[PDB]
Design a protein around this ligand. Structure first.
Ligand SMILES: CN(Cc1cnc2nc(N)nc(N)c2n1)c1ccc(C(=O)N[C@@H](CCC(=O)O)C(=O)O)cc1
Ligand SMILES: CN(Cc1cnc2nc(N)nc(N)c2n1)c1ccc(C(=O)N[C@@H](CCC(=O)O)C(=O)O)cc1
Ligand SMILES: Cc1ncc(COP(=O)(O)O)c(CN[C@@H](CO)C(=O)O)c1O
Ligand SMILES: Cc1ncc(COP(=O)(O)O)c(CN[C@@H](CO)C(=O)O)c1O
Ligand SMILES: Cc1ncc(COP(=O)(O)O)c(CN[C@@H](CO)C(=O)O)c1O
Ligand SMILES: Cc1ncc(COP(=O)(O)O)c(CN[C@@H](CO)C(=O)O)c1O
Lengths: 472, 473, 471, 471
């Protein structure tokens, strides 16, 4: 005799699985009691989450709208059609010149599918070097020749770097390297670069060496949509992105691609038109993915509707203004940030002049409910000892914080780095001894409690703090 | 301007007010799911509790790495959730954690397989899997007669399929053995998407050992049956087991990669005390090689599903799923229809339409119009992709709504009426699709069939949400 | 002061390097005092050798005739043009429908340049399996997965086999495999298959799977020229060959390719023409080789004139008659030759029914001045101890031997195998045991003396036995 | 009824193939009636040519000495062993620390074999850029992405360049690129570079990036053997070469490789030993080649003996002294050479200050019997046409010319570029117009005549001018 449907299938999580329910409630408390500075994180809306947790998860819908492998997709099709056109609308794309696939599971799936569509195995790729602020998915291999990214396993990658004096992209060295290496794909976009991108110059380089030009705008997609960042669609053939960072949506990826007539070309036929659409669609499916995750797609459609509002543009401006205010506060205390400013959502803090390592700061901060991450500095490609931390404004800005609140965050960070110096002063620059100061430290306990009282006092999108299990 | 919208406005308001359009479409899709007869073998209806974990604050957290070795901080509770997910995974599948580990981060099934391949093979290494017209899946490799590489498994690796016996419809182990002796795959893959019989993993191991291949089972379709001990256990013979979690296992949409650990079994010419080293390679392929941040809301939801799957009640359901497939299969054979291998031992029925003079897509498109959802499926010999010769029918989703054998025989009668209407249209308008499409318009028997079907479907419970609360009643 | 030009540069080899001169004189004696049965070996002519050793070795001539990177190639061009046109004439090709590149240094370079011209790295290739009579350059990899041939390193090979019962190529199994595997290149030809090739059935299979069809005719190239073997040019897109085997020329390779209008197809523009010429030329140079070896090409031109004579056709007939006579003799003594006969220049002999492996017979033969080589047979997996030996007729036929002489060769071979059996019976199959019988063996000594006395009575092309150092 | 062996097999070339015989006599005359300045060409000895044109061509000998696949190799082994040990001797290698494979058919086969032995497909390689003086086989792809060398087809290559101002290899740019690219194999050596190489710095660079270090010493093979150039063996893991350039032997290649204990390196186990020998042998055969060309190997053993003499060392000194006397002659006349001198066998002439291209000069020089080749200068690749020519001394030095003769060659080159400019004044730079001056030009007639009388006044190794057909 089967267990009735209402029992296993309709009972709430709290009764079905108190263990997981309790863990989610502890994670809910952690999120609204911490100062969350990881540049790639955000707090998405309850409306997004309600679509994310929905019966859309049940449906297999392989194919694309209007061309499915099987049936039952009448409404899945409307949702995905709406998600795609809301995506082109959010990024101000003429749909006769731009298409988009919203099925990639995440950002790395979106990048690898773009590479699969446009390149053969072992074709050459160039992206921003990791210690210059690039991302793993743009290619990464070690000095010992170990290939870390699958981008470097199945293709041939070579990084370009920032100028080590200024911290800006050395466009001359990029152009020199691309002319020698002759990449078939040139990637722009990054993860820890604190300035905006000159896509026009990337298009000029791309045209000189004959490469396709792809922008991965994942970190700044929210800024791009809000027209608070330079527009990569003006110059790139293909644009990839995540949807969960500054865009403030679910965890998913998108691939945008040109359609229609190609611009004037050196000796190639009149009337030539782009042929990305079919290649990109086929790489996503059937080549790489299986059934799309329709709960992410519907949730993304909600996110994209929310992004295309006057309010979201205000949020994007505030994100930048908050990043700037935090950076100015740290520089006024004597700290040094990379390029002495920011033009986007993040700040790169150089910790070498303090004699501290990104590891120690990240460790201490985490024990004080401040989450950031360590990060290489000024392109210093050496080892496992990052000399900086990366700080981002999207998540706390989403909780309603403005400049003076981010100045308070700067003062919290100042107390943390002061605490870190003092712990290194007493126990030394070796981590296993530094750790002894991290336990039963009343000063740390005081800072952590002041951090949590600060964070507790702001609203939280996505759920109701008044209803959460752990308010204390 | 320069003042942000209040958090309560954009961030806490419910979906029905924030996005009436999307809310309305999800409610239409909710009604569709509980008013049709859902026979797509890879689908299921998961619990509300799984869905509550899936739509949760876990979506906000970046946690690259694994429990106990993250890149970032703040992962105290994500670590407890993922560790719980792994150990419930090993429990549900009866693995000794000293001999088996599991990575639960794959985004879906195809990511799980490509990660397993990346972990164990170099680019262009040889792979063999079950041919699609024999019941296999794309992710095990697929290229066309023209030489077109369809699956990324065939783009980045060198695949060669194996087939069922031309006559019996069972895996042809001798031909398999012969091909692998010649082709010499580095990885031999078992499991499939439309094969109606259980698998002999002991024979696959013998062949794998004979040729020197790693043996991997993709148990996606039968995951719930294996966990329930209602199917042969691949963990007893395979090096690596991959799976989805949203099919018969009835979880969220995700993948898992199981791998052996510890001392290797005695093989000749093998150094004594030899140990498996799948664990580091598989973890590394998932991250940092292939994926980015894990989707923690899926992982937490998977943990819920793995708890639910490891119950006595879930074993009853798996037994019923197999009993419902058989009941439907016997019902269709007793009407004169041709079922592949004349029965089933798992969750699905493979129906051969070629003796009827019918193509799988015709029956698929007519059923869809009557709220019967299935899929056309290649049967042995097929060459087409738009127009294969059969349909594949599964029991898990309608069984999860509480249907038993008698209800599945009513489904069989609905399937008979639909095929008869399909032949009626063909007899009247022609065998060409453009002719055929004329019968699907203003068709009274088709309207009648669609009404009976939804009347039927409406009579059962629905997991995952409350019908008593839906927009469309 | 510099050594005068005449001193180092015009003095004979006997004075400049007596050590090497003496070694070549010892090798000249070996060649006319032994029974030479290596099926890939021949005795080329003095004329070929006078061109091979000439001032042509001095000239760099990268490019093709009329399109060289360097100047001064007026006469290299005429020679290479002469060689190409004589190549087409020898194999009966209309130059409007076939072209040829004569620059490959040897056979293996010819094959790799053909693959490089026609395929991308990792494309699929099918070739005759080695234990079915195939060659390494058509692909070889071990059961353990060791990639042995470059063909298997840079491309993806899968072998096709002979039918177990008949010893003939199994065209049904081939078609089945090619349909599954989907090769882009299907290769025919071999080095130990004793029968001829049905190129029409191969073309039917290649069309069925969408493969290019290449024939490697190296072994039977002299028989093809003479129209004593089926003609691969009737059905193949590309034909590769060596020139030093049955063609009786210098050591070189050639790549023949179709030109001009294509036959009717589908998706092919009406009026389409073959596109092999430029890819093949380019793959040979600049992709793979450097400067051509012009002395080889001039010597090859001479050989190609000598092959296109009525005399060469008599030789090719005799080569085939001698092989049949040898195989018939061995079969009458109870020996198992594969397919129980031959249609070409060689005989393949399964020794496993005798309880022997081919390395034992090859070693004992060698000590008796009989040169052949061990050879895999159907089912073998051993590098060092295959189950057969391969024997071919071109070289000793070139010395004038006819059927009667090859029946005596059979009796020597039968004597050699009986002695191998005696030794094995007495000492064992273990190598260090079998060796115990290879020394102080009076029966061995006698067989060697008989063999060399038989061998010295016949003429020898390439040099004058009357003027050689060791008689 | 076979044709008698003596008619086809022992008759001389002149009566068997008068066409080919005549063309070789024309090419013999051409070789001594002009000024051969192709840096990669030489005139080898009659002794080498006699071994090259010998009965060694008849033998199949797959394998290596003492480890052959079949029989008849008693004297082939002695010859190949002698070639290998003379090779190690000529380049001053301790045989406990160095081995050599002498079977590569030429230089490009040697290089591709070395790569196959040392690297997996698609592994990264760096070599000297072609416009910077490198060679195709070290990698070459076009600005469009077309892969030209098989090196770039089957591996991933990235070139390094000379300094565009000074013409010297930019070693700091190379280190920068190697650190970014991380090649598994770093190649040194080139085809048109007028300076010696800093192998110690290449070793420092290879060790910094974890690369293998190979030298392709083809052009300077003779200078290194004669100890007239830096020794790559002190620093490189592998040395490949041809044998027909400054080494003055037959056309063939060699691969040297280290053996025995490795020197200390951090991260290296104590007692670690080199593992090149089996890999390199296996790549050559059975992976890439078939039968060795034993006539080349025999001819090579001769050339290696001739190279390890006091006479040959005087020749290598004279080669460098002649290249220096030519370079200092041109600089004395206002002309400019890259790096303003040379340390080896060649000069690189910058023609751009004259407003000339290397194409105009190479073609006018051919029309009056001076063979040189156009060449890019200062690593320029954007240039429509090459801005210089390359001139080598080994070939005419082998004819006995000393410094004063190469000064006379300098005057002939001055006349050539003057007469080239004469034509450019009166027809411009468009080659369709420039071609108009290359016909019915009396001044070019006088130059062709003076050059031909000049060349005829010297001896010729390899054959006897007194006995040639065309005098
Ligand atoms: C991904 N896949 C499986 C598959 C399954 N269901 C589908 N369903 C639909 N509606 N469309 C598909 N492309 C489809 N494809 C494919 C894709 C292409 C071919 C294909 O090329 N078929 C050729 C035959 C192969 C050839 O001639 O090269 C044909 O004629 O249909 C087959 C299967
Ligand atoms: C190239 N080739 C054919 C071949 C023919 N004649 C030869 N002759 C000699 N003297 N040596 C050889 N290696 C040799 N090889 C080879 C090479 C390697 C193997 C091999 O690697 N291994 C096994 C077979 C074991 C396996 O199936 O992998 C052996 O012992 O022969 C087989 C054949
Ligand atoms: C054996 C096997 N392995 C892997 C997958 C991939 O699952 P995914 O869609 O989550 O990527 C599938 C999907 N199978 C689905 C979609 O093709 C089906 O309807 O059969 C599968 O059958
Ligand atoms: C530019 C870019 N492209 C792609 C990705 C991958 O997104 P995914 O986690 O969804 O795979 C990232 C993630 N970036 C995260 C994790 O590394 C970060 O903290 O910076 C990215 O920055
Ligand atoms: C360094 C190097 N390595 C290899 C080779 C090729 O030798 P090969 O022609 O015997 O193949 C050359 C030939 N170089 C000739 C033809 O390009 C030349 O005129 O320079 C070379 O310079
Ligand atoms: C069909 C075929 N194609 C190519 C080759 C290679 O010729 P090569 O030695 O000149 O490389 C051979 C060599 N065959 C020789 C050496 O293995 C033999 O004894 O059979 C061949 O048989």
């Amino acid at each position: 005799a089967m267990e009735p449907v209402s029992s296993w299938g309709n009972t709430s999580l709290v009764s079905v699985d108190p263990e997981i329910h309790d863990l989610i409630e502890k994670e809910k408390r952690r999120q609204c009691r911490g100062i969350e500075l990881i540049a790639s994180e955000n707090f998405t809306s309850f409306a997004v989450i309600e679509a994310l947790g929905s019966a859309l998860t049940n449906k297999y819908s392989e194919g694309i709208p209007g061309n499915r492998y099987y049936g039952g997709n009448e409404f899945i099709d409307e949702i995905e059609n709406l998600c795609r056109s809301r995506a082109l609308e959010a990024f101000h794309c003429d749909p006769a010149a731009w298409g988009v696939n919203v099925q990639p599971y995440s950002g790395s799936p979106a990048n690898f599918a773009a590479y699969t569509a446009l390149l053969q195995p072992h074709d050459r790729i160039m992206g921003l070097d990791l210690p210059s602020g690039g991302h793993l998915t743009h290619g990464y291999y070690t000095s010992g020749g170990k290939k870390i990214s699958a981008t470097s396993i199945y293709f041939e990658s070579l990084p370009y770097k920032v100028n080590f004096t200024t911290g800006y992209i050395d466009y001359d060295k990029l152009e020199e390297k691309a002319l020698d290496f002759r990449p078939k794909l040139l990637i722009c976009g990054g993860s820890a670069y604190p300035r905006d991108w000159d896509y026009a110059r990337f298009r000029a380089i791309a045209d000189k060496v004959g490469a396709l030009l792809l922008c991965d705008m994942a970190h700044i997609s929210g800024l791009v949509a809000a027209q608070e960042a330079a527009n990569p669609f003006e110059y790139c053939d293909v644009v990839t992105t995540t949807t969960h960072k500054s865009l403030r949506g679910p965890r998913a990826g998108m691939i945008f691609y040109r359609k229609g007539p190609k611009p004037p070309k050196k000796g190639q036929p009149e009337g030539a038109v782009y042929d990305f659409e079919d290649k990109i669609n086929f790489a996503v499916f059937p080549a790489l993915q299986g059934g799309p995750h329709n709960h992410q797609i519907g949730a993304l459609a909600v996110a994209l509707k929310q992004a295309n509002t006057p309010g979201f543009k205000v949020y994007a401006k505030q994100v930048k203004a908050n990043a700037v205010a935090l950076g100015n506060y740290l520089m006024s205390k004597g700290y040094q940030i990379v390029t002495n400013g920011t033009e986007n959502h993040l700040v790169l803090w150089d910790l070498r002049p303090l004699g501290l390592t990104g590891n120690k700061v990240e460790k201490l901060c985490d024990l004080c409910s401040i989450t950031l991450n360590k990060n290489a500095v000024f392109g210093d490609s050496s080892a496992l000892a990052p000399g900086g931390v990366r700080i981002g404004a999207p998540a706390m800005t989403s909780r309603g914080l403005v400049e003076k609140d981010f100045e308070q965050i700067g003062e919290f960070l100042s107390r943390a780095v002061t605490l870190t110096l003092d712990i290194q002063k007493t126990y030394g620059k070796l981590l296993k001894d530094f750790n002894k100061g991290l336990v039963n430290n009343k000063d740390l306990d005081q800072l952590k409690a002041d951090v949590e009282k600060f964070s507790a006092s702001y609203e939280m999108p996505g759920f109701l703090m008044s209803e959460m299990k752990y308010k204390d």
